[PDB]
DNA sequence: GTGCATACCGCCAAGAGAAAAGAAAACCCA
RNA sequence: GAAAAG
DNA sequence: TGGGTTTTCTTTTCTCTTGGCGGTATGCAC
């Protein structure tokens, strides 16, 4: 949660948000507008704004000023990370419903397969990337939260211990972890921006940097299902647990099937490590026991 | 202390004691000579351990060359060392002038030969053989005749502990060759370690498949059995082949059970192993606690300790026995001590970490010798051979868990072939004879396993050690209210048994107390899966806990059973069979009732109409005379209740407590058609309660007239609660609220009662976060049906408010006492101390709340699992814990003195009284003399300054440090500021008619 | 006297298992 | 994750 | 002074910390 008021090659982001010249239906969510000079910015590209401000202090001078923009505005009052309640009575001005914001913008999107229906600007905080990169993955696969209609773009700021993390692959073996699993096989995650973290200013550091969350028709399967994803991340979680170990020791671990026949299956041969795992190579792991019918016992989650 | 491989090697050589292998003790005793690395972790006391060992086989070459290691390495032989030398010589028979030279040689070095009979803990077979070895030397000498026993002499139990005066001790309803009888099963029963039990399930029809999943699990655990024994004799001859090198292996500690012992735990814990799986640790300290528990009764048993314990107790049970006379009446730990005591020393625990290698060998070689096969579809298909135990992780948090899961195959097994019997641990059920006296902290409760004095969650206790350092005397009262307590025979209400089985074997009925089966569970789409689950997993849990408390019901439904108890560490006492006791639900006290009855006399029906009432939830806030006038009211809605329980007008399911009302109403229904009410015998117990006995307690303490009168201390015509009036004022800012732009006001109406708030206003003079008054306030809500489940939060943070508003200026001193304990536990916590006091009784109590827990790692093949030592290795007391802790501890310690103080008193009077906390029960005839017994304990607790003499102990015990004082002088002050008495008068209380109603 | 095997301790990354819903304020490390 | 007793 | 952490106490049933690498010290064969 930064204030930003730097205005530096706004214009070139405003214009890689913007996409297609001719379109202005893509819609951007700005996340804590608090000065309201990246609002400016956003909206000198010409295409409708809506900012989500939880704040109580900036909020008032948010609705004002709206009448200049004829319309171009639409301010509501909640923030992007808590959207569906999980343990809720009722609904308080910091947290709403996705339902009741989608019902304020009117838009829904019926297929997930189509085109994207809608695009999210945002940032994470000093501390927190972590719990909120799992919380968009755990939206992501099963259906939930902000991606529970559509297939939305969340591109945003993220900082570069992730981006090294996020990123890696059995290159680089020393940081390597789940949610690079998740999110390299999850989204198309390309090059931005990498402005630095301390020339923002706040209301010696890594250095911040910007990403692109766009989710992948290849992600729910015949096999991997969105309502099994748990039975996927079990798998991740504890192969990383102890990273130094063949694939059979965790899979004797984690399922009653021949390891070995699984490995036979997928290609890799017996001394095949976790570590030396592409992300898709987890998929493949995931998805080589589902199609034995006949072995009903799969998992011991 | 000394190292960690210290502590093996001292097990280890004390094993090979206890396993008889004094060769393979020696072989390691000579490789560790020859080196310095590890002769210098040989400390006097394994010498020591093998000089005994050699002394009790009468070896002498060997006892020569253990002394040539004492003296080759510089260490001075110790009293043992001597003792030991002069067993040896008495065993073996040795020329007078030989033992002449060695007790000339013992006494010229410095022995005391006084003090080695008396201070060197050794048995009596040793005190013989060294006795004999020094009478053939000197047969003029003599041990000091015995003392006659310390009688204690506090002004508290100075009545009690007085011989002259007239007593009548009750006595119970079976005679001497029936308790013999009792004494043998229960000695059978803690002898063989476990109970099977016939489960309350109604059964299966027998069917192809049941009866074939029945022979496919048989001969699996055949298989199993066959496997186990193969994989523990090769593990055996290994460590035995790692003990010939000097290597601590185990062995001795595999060797102190037969093979076929340590098989059947080890299956009989793959048994109770369920489906989603126990974590690893846990069945690590599982396996290490019940191989010391089985360990335990098989050294008494080879010891030759059983039979003195029979011919102790058959003489024991004339004083407890109707049809036998004691010459003098006593107290049943004075005719333990009065009659010629066995020995029974304490065992000591083994090391932990010993016991956690002991308990993941037994893991891993339980994990790798049972194995299943894979495809049980079709049993001529070969299938490859998959362990029935699994390794698994759960991550919580940064949190790295393992788990051993099962087979899904074989839980499949399992379900499918549905098991008609239970396993209980001896332990966890309740005892078929009377309880061992409680003699000391060591002996009592059960016959042959050990039991502990003060319950405690961690494995190494400050508690023990605290009530062994203080006088003999001190404890004497709180050990006969615990042999009291555990001196009440107890028998099944079997008609209310019967009611229960019929509701748990059919559909339950989940409003009265009996689980409903998944059955008739419940079955966006993963948000319906995922609430089934939920609601599945909660209803299956308690249906398992109320199949496993009605099928102990059901075993004990013909047999009269005694609850042996136990203290916590503030004072409170519990009962230690923990599924089936007075202590739990409705359910459960509806179920038991007093095995001996009195006849109810001239005021008995009368206190029983009005305890029936007092199970009703009504006229609450009414006097005696309108209770029994509602009583004779409500006479027919009594008898067609009891008559007609599920059939009739169904009165009974109203109550607050239905079952206890239920019972209640059978009683009361039996009495009135009784021919001569007062000669009608009652066995069921009649319960007089507290109204907020801390507020008693705290008004006690500060002479506030006000509480007094507010809680039943000053006499009334009409009883007094404080949540009533608490609950009106938040009903006055309710409505005041109403009619304004407030929804919870509207939403609320007529749901503030006295039980929302019960909790609260019962908690606050223990210091109370307002955040946890949310939740305090909401599962009361929440279980509401009426109750809109939107504003569960909003109508929590609204009585968090309003209530706090309505508790200011009020309860002055009591706050004043609250602040000062809190204030004195804050101050001694923050000088690196435990809040330690002693009760007017006379027993200790700390605290044992420590942050930062000293862990330690275990290396392994599995996995290394974290132990945590708390045995005071830990050395930063817990602020906050002891803040939060202190003001309620206090109060439990005095009302837990006030109900020792009762019984011992009820005790003289021939009385039979047990108690829940702050709950008095007796029998319906008794009541009035427990109601005035009770007051004047209660005078005579409080006219003791409680107040001041915690002062002055606090600033002898916690204030008098050499240089500490400087700072500690703020602490001083403040222990010695006890806000004043008020102006309330005790005496009073002795014509308090609603002080316990 | 030198190199290798063994055991012990530190120490940060654990993927700070999603609750980043929440009215509430005091305590200990930085 | 739930339930019960004080 | 700014920021991470817990929320009155006890007891019982159901069923919630491990792993990997690197550096340092120590003991033993040639
Ligand atoms: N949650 C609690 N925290 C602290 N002490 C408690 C708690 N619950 C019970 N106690 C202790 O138990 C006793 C109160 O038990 P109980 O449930 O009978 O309440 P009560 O206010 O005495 O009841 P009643 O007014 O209905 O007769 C007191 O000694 C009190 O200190
Ligand atoms: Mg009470």
Redesign the interface.
Known sequence: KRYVTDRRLAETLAQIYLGKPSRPPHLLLECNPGPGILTQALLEAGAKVVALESDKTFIPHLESLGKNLDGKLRVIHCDFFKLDPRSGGVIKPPAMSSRGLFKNLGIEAVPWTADIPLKVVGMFPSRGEKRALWKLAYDLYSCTSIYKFGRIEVNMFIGEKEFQKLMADPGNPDLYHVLSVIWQLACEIKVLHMEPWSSFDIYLQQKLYLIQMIPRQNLFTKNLTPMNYNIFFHLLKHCFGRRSATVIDHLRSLTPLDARDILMQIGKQEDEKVVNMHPQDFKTLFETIERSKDCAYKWLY | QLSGQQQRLLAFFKCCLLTDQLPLAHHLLVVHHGQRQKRKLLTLDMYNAVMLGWARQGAFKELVYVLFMVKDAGLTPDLLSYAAALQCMGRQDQDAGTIERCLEQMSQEGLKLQALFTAVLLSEEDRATVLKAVHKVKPTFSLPPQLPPPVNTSKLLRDVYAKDGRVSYPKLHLPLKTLQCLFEKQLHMELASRVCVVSVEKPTLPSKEVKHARKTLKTLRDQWEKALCRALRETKNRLEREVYEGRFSLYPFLCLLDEREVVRMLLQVLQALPAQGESFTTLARELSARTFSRHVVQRQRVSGQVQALQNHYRKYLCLLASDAEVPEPCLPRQYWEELGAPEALREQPWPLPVQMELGKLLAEMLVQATQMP?SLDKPHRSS?L??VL????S?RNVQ?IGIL?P???YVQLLEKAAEPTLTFEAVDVPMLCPPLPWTSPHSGAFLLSPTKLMRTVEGATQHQELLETCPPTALHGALDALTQLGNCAWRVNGRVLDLVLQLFQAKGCPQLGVPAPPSEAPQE??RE?AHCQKVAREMHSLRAEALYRLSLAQHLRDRVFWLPHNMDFRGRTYPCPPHFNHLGSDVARALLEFAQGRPLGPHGLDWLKIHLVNLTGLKKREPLRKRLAFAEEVMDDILDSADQPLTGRKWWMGAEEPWQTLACCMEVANAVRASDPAAYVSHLPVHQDGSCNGLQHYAALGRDSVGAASVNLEPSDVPQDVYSGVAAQVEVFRRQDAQRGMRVAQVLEGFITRKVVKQTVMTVVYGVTRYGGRLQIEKRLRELSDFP??????ASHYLVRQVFKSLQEMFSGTRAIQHWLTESARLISHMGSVVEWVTPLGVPVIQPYRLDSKVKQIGGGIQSITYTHNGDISRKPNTRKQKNGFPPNFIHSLDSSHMMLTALHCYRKGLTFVSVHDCYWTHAADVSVMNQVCREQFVRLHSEPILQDLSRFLVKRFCSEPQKILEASQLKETLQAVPKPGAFDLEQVKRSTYFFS
């Open positions: 894979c490859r998959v362990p699994y390794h698994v992780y991550f790295q899961k087979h899904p195959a789409l993963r899966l489940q939107e504003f569960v939060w909003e």
